Amino acid sequence: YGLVTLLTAGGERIFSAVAFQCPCSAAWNLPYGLVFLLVPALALFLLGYVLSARTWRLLTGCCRGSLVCTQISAAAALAPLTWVAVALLGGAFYECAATGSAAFAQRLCLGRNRSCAAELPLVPCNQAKASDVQDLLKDLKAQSQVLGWILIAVVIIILLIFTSVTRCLSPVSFLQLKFWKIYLEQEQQILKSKATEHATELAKENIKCFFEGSHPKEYNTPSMKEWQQISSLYTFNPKGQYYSMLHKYVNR
Amino acid sequence: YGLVTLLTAGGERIFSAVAFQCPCSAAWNLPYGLVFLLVPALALFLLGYVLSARTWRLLTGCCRGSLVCTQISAAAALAPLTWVAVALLGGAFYECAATGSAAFAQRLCLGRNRSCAAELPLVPCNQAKASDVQDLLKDLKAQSQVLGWILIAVVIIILLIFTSVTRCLSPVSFLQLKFWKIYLEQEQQILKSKATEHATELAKENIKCFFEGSHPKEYNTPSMKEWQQISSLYTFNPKGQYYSMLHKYVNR
Amino acid sequence: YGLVTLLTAGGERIFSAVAFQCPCSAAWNLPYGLVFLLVPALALFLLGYVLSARTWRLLTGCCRGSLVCTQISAAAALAPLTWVAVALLGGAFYECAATGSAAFAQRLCLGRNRSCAAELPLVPCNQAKASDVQDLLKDLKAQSQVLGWILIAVVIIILLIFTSVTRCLSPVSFLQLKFWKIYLEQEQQILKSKATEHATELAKENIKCFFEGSHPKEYNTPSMKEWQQISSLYTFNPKGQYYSMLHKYVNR
Amino acid sequence: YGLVTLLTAGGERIFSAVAFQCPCSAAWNLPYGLVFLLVPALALFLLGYVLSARTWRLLTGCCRGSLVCTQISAAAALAPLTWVAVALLGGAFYECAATGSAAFAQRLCLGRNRSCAAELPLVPCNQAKASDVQDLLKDLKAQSQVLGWILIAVVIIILLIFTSVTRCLSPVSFLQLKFWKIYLEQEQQILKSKATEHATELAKENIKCFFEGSHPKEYNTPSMKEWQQISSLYTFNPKGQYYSMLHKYVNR
Amino acid sequence: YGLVTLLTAGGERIFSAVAFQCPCSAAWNLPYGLVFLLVPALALFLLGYVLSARTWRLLTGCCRGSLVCTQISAAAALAPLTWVAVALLGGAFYECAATGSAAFAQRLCLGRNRSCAAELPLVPCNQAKASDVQDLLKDLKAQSQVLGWILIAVVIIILLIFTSVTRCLSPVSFLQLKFWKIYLEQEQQILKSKATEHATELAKENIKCFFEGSHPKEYNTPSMKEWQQISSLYTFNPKGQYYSMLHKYVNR
Amino acid sequence: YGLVTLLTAGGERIFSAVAFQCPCSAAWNLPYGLVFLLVPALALFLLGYVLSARTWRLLTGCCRGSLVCTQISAAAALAPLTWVAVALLGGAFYECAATGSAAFAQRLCLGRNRSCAAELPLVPCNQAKASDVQDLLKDLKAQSQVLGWILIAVVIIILLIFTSVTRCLSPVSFLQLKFWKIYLEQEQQILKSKATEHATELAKENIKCFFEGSHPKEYNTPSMKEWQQISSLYTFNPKGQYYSMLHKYVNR
Amino acid sequence: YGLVTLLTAGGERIFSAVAFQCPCSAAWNLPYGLVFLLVPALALFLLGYVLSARTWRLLTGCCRGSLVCTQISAAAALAPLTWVAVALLGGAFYECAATGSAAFAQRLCLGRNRSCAAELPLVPCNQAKASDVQDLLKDLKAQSQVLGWILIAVVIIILLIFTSVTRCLSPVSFLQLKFWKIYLEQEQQILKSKATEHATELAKENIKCFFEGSHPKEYNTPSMKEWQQISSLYTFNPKGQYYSMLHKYVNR
Amino acid sequence: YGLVTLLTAGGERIFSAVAFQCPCSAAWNLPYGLVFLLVPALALFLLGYVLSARTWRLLTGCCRGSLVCTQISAAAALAPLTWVAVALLGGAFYECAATGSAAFAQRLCLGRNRSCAAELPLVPCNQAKASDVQDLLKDLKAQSQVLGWILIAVVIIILLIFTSVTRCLSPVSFLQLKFWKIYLEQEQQILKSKATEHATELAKENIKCFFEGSHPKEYNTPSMKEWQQISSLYTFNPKGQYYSMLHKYVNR
């Protein structure tokens, strides 16, 4: 129960602290909103760029290269656009971005009060009492929500076009592509299991020879150059079907 | 419990943020309502256009074609019309679409206050106090609900006519069509299972030959051209009953 | 828990949105009530006309015919009358239908205020304050509930007469009719099961021959013309008892 | 959980809609109460007249007959009298029936206000403020409850006399009648089970002969005329004890 | 859950409708209270007169007779006196019976206000404000509770005397009477079971002979006159101990 | 759940109806309290006089006798004194018995107001406002509680003396008396079981001979005079230890 | 659930009725408090004097004797002192005993108001408003609590001294006394079990001989004089260790 | 559930009755606080002096002796100091002990009001309104809490020094002392079990010889003098290791 109580207390503290006031300030407010827009987005973008095992396979070993890189970058950049869309639909952040550069303000307000740019930043702060800006906050909320929805539409459209073209120009057919993906899944699980038990037997034998203090068995040697050889990425050629480069490396 | 608490917090944030104020604005309001009508509808339309495995079979491989395309498009377009109907029945969105182009306003209001078009947009905003428009918001709600119900009737009617004609002109009878669909279902499940275990044995053999470092078995080769050959779509001819083109491809 | 929470949220949104205000309008109100009466009724009528497997058997195959058609139409039209009865007993819809054509209003009001037809539509809206119409709304509620109950009586009476005559003029007796229906039920379940397993073996054999790449077995052929032949509908003749036309088709 | 939530919502809607206001109207009120008394009673009467399997046995086959018909009609009419008794004990319905024909009103009120018949119908409506009728509503409630209880007494008395005479004049004794009813119960269950499995074997054999496409077995024929012969109703004669006419039909 | 919800709704409706107002009326009130006293009592009396299997044994077969009849009538009349006692202890009913015939009123009130009989019936109605009757309602409540308790004492006394005399004059002793009752209980259960299985075998044999269409077995015949012979009631004679007349009928 | 809900409703009705107001009346109040004291006490006394199987053994068979009768009467009269003690400790009943005969009142009140006997009965009714009686109600509550506790002491004392003397003058010792009571308990249970199964076999044999219609077995006869002989009560004599007269009746 | 509901209702009634008001009365109050102190104490004292099986062994059989009698009386009188201590610590009872004889009052009050003895009894009643006695109630509460605690100390001290001396002068040592008590416990349980089964076999044999009606077995006779002989109490002599007089009676 | 409900009711009564008012009295207050300090402490001290089995071994048998006596007294006096410390930390008791002898008061108050000793006792009673004593109650609370904490420190210090010296001067080492304590624990449990079963066999044999009435077996005799011999206390000598004097008594 200790973990549960500490976690609820931590969550409450975290959220009460991330309370978003949108400080009404003449010049320090724009970055305040901008970081709450971009920085968590950049964070999730980086974590996506990290998590996928597809990129590490290419990166390791002392670092055509465009296609794979843009593919992985988009497959990871899926999510940060979702965060920025959800946030922009939250309305608070962009409403806080109202001030921005003075150009936004001068172009923004209808020019009714003739005193916009001076203390417009008070408009999400609710402290200004001029009727014009009290109506302008609403229009800013509108622009925020609309821009957010337009972005979440553009992202889904781009995902469609990307995956459709990637499914259109491949040489292999569909009903074979499904079987191929099932194959690679099974290969990964089998590799995990059997490599696990083989490392287990290696460790057992060597550690027993150490406890006794005698010569080892010398059963076999997994070649390191062979390991690097099977880490290749592309895994396709029209002639040598040979999926999963490991499987391709059984002819020699 | 962490997932549960985070999900409820996320849901509450999401819904409190998608709070729909319908900002009363002279010109920026129309698109505000229009995107909340169309964009989620377009989103669900695209996801439907994506999800069904029937279309990918046709699309892959470097892209009469009308019939299958309109069939799949309608079978996927079922749902977006449901979203737009539910939303239009919500009333808020179309009520927000009241303003639109000025033509809607000039034709819309009874001309009582003679000051409609100037600040009609305040009518869902509840800020205008002229009696005429305070009554006009109600009529707009009515037009919204009625249009929504008419649309949800037209969509069900169209679905009826579509599925009835598609069931009317087919050469095969009913009690055989049911058995045929059961057959294709069983074939899909059997294919999944046996292809899974065959890929499993392939991976096991090849990965063992790799761990040992010796020649593979060369059991058999699933031909890629054969795979593409069995991905065909139509699966009917009056003479060669041969359902499920895979099954049709057993004569040669 | 995600499904549960999303479903309760969706239900609350759906019902709060289907909130029925009965907009008080001089001319746009009548259709508002009329669609909420008829359209869901038409919807349930269509779904009934769709769901029953009895009609598809007749319809498929390029489309005395009166009797079966009216039987199926009534057996499906059972429910829409129930919806319209429940709704009319709800009172709100017909109360909203008060205005209708002006003929209803002129014949309706007792002529006390002499100003009925002008702004009677306000009477379910509760905005009119003339005593005469404030009493007239009550009488309209009465007419609604009474008409609803009369309809729900007429529908049960018609169902009685229909099923009684259909049970009266049949040649077969009762205690045999029960056994016959049990027989057809068992036949349907047996057909489902055995056709399932036979399609399973067909798919298994053909898919194995495909994986290997060799000739199939050629066990037997379910004739398509035979399938259509056994899809017949009537299933009765005084001489050849032969229930369930499939069973009738065992003599030749 | 979906069914549970939808059912509670439906029940709440149904009951809130069947809210009984007893509209105070000069002439349209009497039928309003009368239908809520009679129509659900007629409904339950019809469902009783339908549900019992005893009547269908007599009715089917192209339609002394008095005794069985009055027996079944009373055995089914048990319940509608219970509904009308419960409703009359509810008090609202008969209180609404106060107005009725003017004869009821003129005979009803004590003649104190001398203005009864004009706007007596307001008396359950609570809108009239004359002391005489405000006391008269109470007496009407009394007459309702008393009449209801008298009816629920008369119905139980009639049930007593009916079942007692039916138990008095039968030739067979009691301790044998109990065993006879147990016998018929067991016979019904055995018939259900064995007819079920026999229809199952019939369907299995015929459907296998169809799948193969060969001649059937011709095991035996349940004669339809025999089926009608065993559907007889009376099942008694002093000489040939032979309960359950099916059992009577074993001599020839 | 449907049954549970419908039952609680029905119970609430039933009890809210059986709400007992005791309408204050000059002449229609007395029967109002009297029926709520007697009619449910008569109902439970009749159900008791029905339920016991002891009376049917005597009644069937075309209808000393005093003793058995008064015994069964008292054994069933136990409960209605309990209902009337509980109700009279409820106080509301007899308080409503205050008015009754005018003789009760004239003898009842102390004659203080000299205006009792005119509008005494208002006294449980709480509408009369004369101090004398406002005190008289209390005395009436007292008379009700006291009479109820005296009745519930008289009924228990009568039950004592009845069962004691019935236990006093019997020829058999106690420790044998207990064993005799255990015997009859076991005999009833054995008869139920074995008659059940024998009717089961009868039905099975006859229904099989019907399905096949051949002659029955003719195993044995339970004689109907024998059945009536064993339905006798008295079951005692000093010489032929022979409990349970069925058992008495084993000598011939 | 039906039983649970009906029972709670019945209990609430029962207790709300047994609400004890102690009607303040000049002459009808004394019996009101007196019956609520004595009648339930008499009821529980009678049920005790009934329940014990010890008395029936003596009573049956056409009805020194003092000792057994007073023993059983006291062993059953234990409880009614407990009821009257609990009630008297309740205080309400005796407080209601304040008035009683006028002698109690004249001796009771201190004579301060000189107007006691006229309307003293109002003193538990709280309607009288003279200070003297408002203090006198408290003293009456005191007399009630004290008398109750004195009675509950006298009853326990009497129980002590009774059981002690009954344990003092018996000839048998203690450690043998315990074993004797265990013996009689075991004998009762064994008799129940074996008599049950013997009656079961009797019924089985006779009912089988009836179903077949043949002569019975004539196994043995439990003599009725023997049954009465073993129903004797005293079960002691210094010479023939022979507990449990049944056991005493094994010598001849 | 019936027992649970009835028990909670009974408990609530019991405790609400044992509500302790301490009636302020000039002379009837002292016994009111005194009985609530002594009588339940006497009750628990008597139940203790009854429950212990040690005293009955001495008492039965037509009634040095000081030591055993005072031992058992103290071992049972443990609890009543606990009740009186808890009650005296309750404070209400002794506070009610304030008045007592007039000597307590005259010695009690400081003599400030000079009007103590007249209406001091009002002091726990809170009705007197003289400051002196309003302070005197507090001192009386103090005297009550202090006396209670002194008594609960004296009782524990006496228990200590009693059990210590009883453990000091016994001839046997400790580690043997523990084993002896374990022995007597085991002997009691063994006696219960084996006497139970022996009485069971006795009853079985005799009741079978009765059912058959033949001579008994005459296995053996437990001598009654022997039973009394083994009921002796003291169970000690320095020479013949022979615990548990039953065990002592194995030499002859 | 009865035990649970009675226990919660008893606990509530007990605690509501032990409510501590600290009666403000000039002279009767000091003992009031002093008994609530000392008497429960003395009680727990006595129960500790009783419970430990170590002291009884020394005490029994007609009563260097200093060391064991002070050891057991301290090991039992652990707890009463804890009670008095907790109570003194409660603050109420010592605050009530404020008055005490007049010397405490005269030395206590700062002499500001010059009227301390007269009615200082009102200071925990909150009835005195002089500012000086209203501040003095706080200082008294302080002195109470501080003294309590100093006492709970002194007791832990004394326990440390006691157990450390007792662990310092013993001849045996630690790792052997632990094993010795484990040994004595196992010996106690083994003795309990085997003595139990041996007493069981003794009782069984003797009670069987009694039931039969014949001579016993005379298996063996546990000598009473031997029992006392093995009850010795010290259990140590440097030469004869022989833990657990019972074990020491195996040489002769």
Residue numbers in the entry:
A (entry chain E), B (entry chain D), C (entry chain C), D (entry chain B), E (entry chain A), F (entry chain J), ...: 20 to 82, 94 to 282
From the manuscript:
In humans, the CALHM family encompasses six paralogs, some of which function as non-selective channels that are permeable to large substances such as ATP. We identified the three paralogs, CALHM2, 4 and 6, to be highly expressed in this organ. The CALHM subunits thus constitute unique modular building blocks that assemble with different stoichiometries into large membrane channels. In contrast to previously described CALHM structures, where the oligomeric state of individual channels was described as uniform, our data show heterogeneous populations with CALHM4 and CALHM6 assembling as decameric and undecameric channels with similar abundance and CALHM2 as predominantly undecameric proteins with a smaller population of dodecamers. Despite the unknown activating stimuli, our study has provided insight into gating transitions of CALHM channels by showing two conformations with either a cylindrical pore of uniform large dimeter within the membrane that is constricted at the intracellular side as in case of CALHM4 and a conical pore that continuously narrows from its extracellular entry towards the cytoplasm as in case of CALHM6.
Both assemblies of CALHM6 contain subunits with equivalent conformations, which are better defined in the smaller oligomers. We have thus chosen the decameric CALHM6 structure for a description of the conical pore of a CALHM channel. Unlike CALHM4, the lower resolution of the CALHM6 density of 4.4 Å, precludes a detailed interpretation of the structure for all parts of the protein. Unlike CALHM4, there is no dimerization of CALHM6 channels and the C-terminal region following the cytoplasmic helix CTH instead appears to engage in intramolecular interactions with the outside of the cytoplasmic rim for most of its length. Upon comparison of decameric channels of both paralogs, in CALHM6 we find a slight expansion of the protein parallel to the membrane and an accompanying moderate contraction in perpendicular direction. In a superposition of the subunits, similar conformations are observed for α-helices TM2 and 4 and the C-terminal helix CTH and larger differences in the interacting helices TM1 and 3. These differences are most pronounced for TM1, which in CALHM6 has detached from TM3 and moved by 60° towards the pore axis around a hinge located upstream of a conserved phenylalanine at the end of TM1.
